[PDB]
């Protein structure tokens, strides 16, 4: 099914639509989880594995988990139905727009090295440790500082 990719993109768009409608923070977190799932799917679709996993073990993982945790604490008060309605409204409009170009999976995996032995996602990002050694030092400093920023801002 060549449409597979488009289908996924649409789902992602719809999920972000829900987040856009700003439902209950918990509903929002749930929606994002669905979208993140769609996201790893799409990345994997292109061929990237490690990359797809990351969003999963990072977003579908704690990213929303803490959000979830968080919300429990600061979000107490539960029109979501109306929101759901507008969501369907958007869906059709979204569909309508694609139908606009309708009147007016062909090329993916644009290029590939059929025989290859050391090509695969992650290898490139593994070069954070060699020939890209400034990305990961700055990211490490980001985390090491973020510790301090959060501990005082909570203090």
């Amino acid at each position: 099914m060549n449409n597979y990719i488009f289908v996924l993109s649409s789902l992602f768009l719809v999920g972000c639509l829900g987040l856009a409608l700003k439902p209950s923070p918990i509903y929002g977190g749930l929606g994002l989880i669905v979208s993140g799932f769609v996201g790893c799917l799409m990345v994997l679709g292109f061929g990237g594995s490690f990359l797809g996993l990351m969003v999963f073990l990072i977003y579908l993982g704690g990213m929303l988990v803490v959000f979830g945790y968080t919300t429990a604490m600061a979000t107490e008060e539960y029109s979501n139905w109306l929101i759901l309605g507008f969501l369907v409204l958007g869906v059709i409009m979204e569909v309508f727009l694609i139908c606009v170009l309708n009147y007016y999976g062909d090329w993916l995996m644009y290029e590939v090295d059929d025989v290859g032995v050391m090509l695969e996602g992650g290898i490139g990002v593994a070069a954070m440790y060699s020939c890209a050694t400034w990305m990961m030092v700055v990211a490490g400093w980001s985390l090491f500082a973020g510790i301090f920023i959060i501990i005082e801002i909570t203090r």
């Binding site: 918990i26 594995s49 073990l57 993982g61 704690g62 988990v65 979830g68 945790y69």
Partner: protein, 317 residues
């Protein structure tokens, strides 16, 4: 065929999942000077099927609760557990996910949603507290759980569970890396909310927050999930650290050996439950953010240096 191979690998596990509760209600019994259930059926073999039928027949109470989420959490739970058994590397694993361990790690994390959402959906104070307590312990034990695996992988060379059968052709990964096995075993005890670490449904302390309002069919599905997990995590211990013998000519030996070790380590968490009182919530997390996490981080380094200074980098096949 592939469909048949889905019945096998599922039913067989479900039937075994049922026989674990029985071997739990008898091994706990004999340890406590009591026969356990032997009157229904012969030696209690029909006992697991009996309450399953009662549970499904009793009314599925829908408290006056977010229905969708309330009903979804059970579904997710079982879905995840059965799914995590797909890539396990018993010989010729159902599906050679190249990054299997990552997959296992991923699905294992998603389970937390079930407990969290269940508590939120239940709308009962007991349940709420249960969820909060559960999410915290669960995720935290995930942080050491993941690092312990990363140490393993770096000595295996890949994320695929199939590689360890070739890594452990001469010695179990317990000999090396035993210090983490223990820490994998204790973390496997936390993630299946079994006894030493079962504050999720302490019953005595707080009354089963996870399923306070859940009864009948919903109770059963998580229920089934927990026990299947109880096995799966034990089985992952029996592949990652206790490597069963394997022979290409005779692939069965592995399964048979895998069976014996899985049953004994599954027996062990049954034995742990009866033997120990339950850790406090604070105590539980301290152990992991305090007693273990520093242990798990350091050894990670040792396992990074080990290969290099021993020029023991593993093949990437």
């Amino acid at each position: 065929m592939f469909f048949i191979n889905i019945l096998t690998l599922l039913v067989p596990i479900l039937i075994a999942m049922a026989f674990l509760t029985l071997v739990e209600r008898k091994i706990l019994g004999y340890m406590q000077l009591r026969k356990g259930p032997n009157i229904v059926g012969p030696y209690g073999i029909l006992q697991p099927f009996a309450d399953a039928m009662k549970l499904f027949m009793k009314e599925p109470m829908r408290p006056l609760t977010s229905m969708s989420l309330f009903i979804i959490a059970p579904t997710l739970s079982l879905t995840l557990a059965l799914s995590l058994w797909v890539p396990l590397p018993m010989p010729h694993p159902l599906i050679n996910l190249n990054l299997g361990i990552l997959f296992i790690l991923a699905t294992s994390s998603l389970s937390v949603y079930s407990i969290l959402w269940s508590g939120w959906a239940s709308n009962s104070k007991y349940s709420l507290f249960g969820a909060l307590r559960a999410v915290a312990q669960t995720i935290s034990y995930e942080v050491t759980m993941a690092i312990i695996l990363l140490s393993v992988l770096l000595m295996n060379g890949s994320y695929s569970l199939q590689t360890l059968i070739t890594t452990q052709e001469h010695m179990w990964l317990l000999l090396p890396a035993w210090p983490m096995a223990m820490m994998w075993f204790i973390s496997t005890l936390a993630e299946t909310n079994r006894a030493p670490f079962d504050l999720t449904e302490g019953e005595s302390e707080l009354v089963s927050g996870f399923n306070v309002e859940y009864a009948a069919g919903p109770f059963a599905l998580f229920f089934m999930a927990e026990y299947t997990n109880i096995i799966l995590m034990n089985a992952l211990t029996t592949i990652i650290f206790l490597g069963p013998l394997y022979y290409i000519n005779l692939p069965e030996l592995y399964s048979t050996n895998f069976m014996m070790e899985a049953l004994l380590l599954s027996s062990t968490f049954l034995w742990i439950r009866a033997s120990y009182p339950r850790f406090r919530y604070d105590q539980l997390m301290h152990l992991l953010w305090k007693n273990f996490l520093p242990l798990t981080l350091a050894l990670c380094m040792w396992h990074i240096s080990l290969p290099i200074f021993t020029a023991g980098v593993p093949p990437y096949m």
